[PDB]
Amino acid sequence: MIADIDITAPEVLRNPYALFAELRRTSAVGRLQPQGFMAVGRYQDVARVLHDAKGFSNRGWAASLPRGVKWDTSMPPSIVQVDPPRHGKLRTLVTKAFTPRTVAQLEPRIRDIAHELVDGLRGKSTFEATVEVTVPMPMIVIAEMLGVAPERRADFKRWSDDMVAQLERSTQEFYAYFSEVLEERRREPREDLISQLLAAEVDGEKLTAGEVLSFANTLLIAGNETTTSLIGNALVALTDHPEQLAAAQADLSLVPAVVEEVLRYESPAQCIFRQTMTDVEIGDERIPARSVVLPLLASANRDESRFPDPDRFDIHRDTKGHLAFGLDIHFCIGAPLARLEAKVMLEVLLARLGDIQRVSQEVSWSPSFFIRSPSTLPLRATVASA
């Protein structure tokens, strides 16, 4: 039933949109079993939830955290777990460092990274797109933004891979290293994000050291797997829609639109987390106080109410108002960076690769309801040099 949703079901992992459509048709609210989490599927309702920060707290994100893992309790929580009024203070501080200006200025380096990744494909007629392209790009870009020393880049990869007993070690090593980095940049700042986070000051208030480190950590967790997902999902959508791929390969100015339609069609973050603070009502369904609630961004983005023929992938549709990056106060800080990495990587892939096909018609999706991404994506294509 819609009151007995099993996210482990192979059909749900394969095609969650069938469940989502059934939920939207049936009820404003669904229930996951055995987690007991409440799911909200209709576009208007998802938007209402995200705009209602007083009724739907971000402390719900605590429900997503891996059990059996010891957290350094001197580390403040991720910004994504914080509610007003603390949230606004923190967000205004971190976005003095992680700014649209700093993201836009990365584009030349991002293009170079894209070209180097495609250089690794030369002389091959098949490649595995995740390991060779979509997984490295976000991780390389964020390590450069954070000022990671060249000799610590492989440790950073390992930490990144582990965050997608081992997990505890990687988290401890991440913070040990960035603590050291933070003290070095207090002495001699550079142009990197740690330096800029340390400098930030608003109304004579500054981030604590814990807050700097916690935000650094958030950027890996928040940014890597989701951006990887966007690029892989784009490759899946384009290979499923040959004529659209063909169109974009002939006109690279389409790529921003491709990216927006993948964001809507195969939303990387399929849902997010909230917790009700009171008894609340959505679409005449009451949700008890203290329930974990999953606003189903992916369901909202495929809601016929908002997006006509929503199961049609159409790079020429109007994508305005999709909720892939959320909405309102917690709207993705990384949204310009994700959009830029994806545009640049797809511009380079599309320009340099000839005919692109999947090896397999079947996509092996990662076994996550929460993040929609290919576990592997073997592709057939020929490279043309940069």
Ligand code: HEM
């Ligand atoms: C396609 C890629 C991405 C998607 C789909 C995505 C999606 C989202 C969503 C849905 C939220 C809102 C969470 C909420 O309301 O609880 C969010 C928040 C956030 N994302 Fe992203 N994101 C992506 C990439 C990035 C990247 C590249 C970064 C940074 C490098 C990043 C950093 C953040 C941060 C810091 C927040 C928290 C903002 C806050 O709580 O105020 N994200 N993301």
